[PDB]
């Protein structure tokens, strides 16, 4: 009734309240890191042999 | 040649590491799969150590070719009475870093091969087939590459 009347809904006491605590809601990378280190190792090999 | 013991003490390491993710994401049975693991590690250690020697043996000369002038500089700065230091130290001076790079490169090479096979080709295959093909191909291909 209050909601339909746009009355203050806070005046109406609930029977009880419950507080609900809500806390809220790789292989590519491994290949990439190994690739980059190996590629720079290849550059190192070229310089070493150069 | 007797230094090969170190190679044997190194070539096996990488062969067994992937067991973690295989037991965690491929959920391999470590008891039944131990048959495959032992063979794979043994073959890898054999050929990889042989590769270690081959790479270093094939390239060690370059170290002296490059830096022997500097090594001689420090040797003298420290002819028969003079040359002895060459045999005692200089040869090992070239050898020491030659081994370090040979093993370093071989190990660096191994990782990508297994990563590519397991997680980019054998994605769509049985974990049993995944481990079999990935490790076997890695070992054979890498050893052949070392012979390149």
From Swiss-Prot, chain A:
Subcellular location field: Endoplasmic reticulum membrane
Domain of life, source organism: Eukaryota
Residue intervals on the Cytoplasmic side: 43-50
Transmembrane segments: 26-42
Subunit structure as annotated in this protein's UniProt entry: Heterotetramer of TRAP-alpha, TRAP-beta, TRAP-delta and TRAP-gamma.
Family: Belongs to the TRAP-delta family.
Known role: TRAP proteins are part of a complex whose function is to bind calcium to the ER membrane and thereby regulate the retention of ER resident proteins.
Disease the record associates with this protein: Congenital disorder of glycosylation 1Y: A form of congenital disorder of glycosylation, a multisystem disorder caused by a defect in glycoprotein biosynthesis and characterized by under-glycosylated serum glycoproteins. Congenital disorders of glycosylation result in a wide variety of clinical features, such as defects in the nervous system development, psychomotor retardation, dysmorphic features, hypotonia, coagulation disorders, and immunodeficiency.
Name of this chain's protein: Translocon-associated protein subunit delta
Source species of the chain: Homo sapiens
Encoding gene, per UniProt annotation: SSR4
Full-protein positions shown: 117 to 173 of 173
Swiss-Prot record, chain B:
Organismal lineage: Eukaryota, Metazoa, Chordata, Craniata, Vertebrata
Keyword match Transcription: no
Highest taxon of source: Eukaryota
Gene Ontology BP terms: SRP-dependent cotranslational protein targeting to membrane
Localization: Endoplasmic reticulum membrane
Gene: SSR3
GO cellular component, one term: endoplasmic reticulum
Entries under InterPro entries matching the protein: SSR3 (IPR009779)
Membrane-spanning residues: 3-23, 30-51, 101-122, 129-148
Lumenal side: 52-100
Protein name: Translocon-associated protein subunit gamma
């Amino acid at each position: 009734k209050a909601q339909r009347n746009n009355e203050d809904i806070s005046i109406i006491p609930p029977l009880f309240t419950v507080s609900v605590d809500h806390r809220g809601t790789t292989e590519v990378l491994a290949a990439a890191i190994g690739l980059v280190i190996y590629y720079l190792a290849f550059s190192a090999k070229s310089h070493i042999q150069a | 040649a007797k230094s090969s013991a170190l190679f044997f003490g190194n070539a096996f390491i990488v062969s067994a590491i992937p067991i973690w993710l295989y037991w965690r994401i491929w959920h391999m049975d470590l008891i039944q799969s131990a048959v495959l693991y032992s063979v794979m590690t043994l073959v890898s250690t054999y050929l990889v150590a042989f590769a270690y020697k081959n790479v270093k043996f094939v390239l060690k000369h370059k170290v002296a070719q490059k830096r022997e002038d500097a090594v001689s500089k420090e040797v003298t700065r420290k002819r028969k009475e003079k040359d002895e230091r060459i045999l005692w130290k200089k040869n090992e001076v070239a050898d020491y870093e030659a081994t370090t790079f040979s093993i370093f490169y071989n190990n660096t090479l191994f990782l990508v091969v297994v990563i590519v096979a397991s997680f980019f080709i054998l994605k769509n295959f049985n974990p049993t087939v995944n481990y079999i093909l990935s490790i076997s191909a890695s070992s054979g291909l890498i050893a052949l590459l070392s012979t390149g």
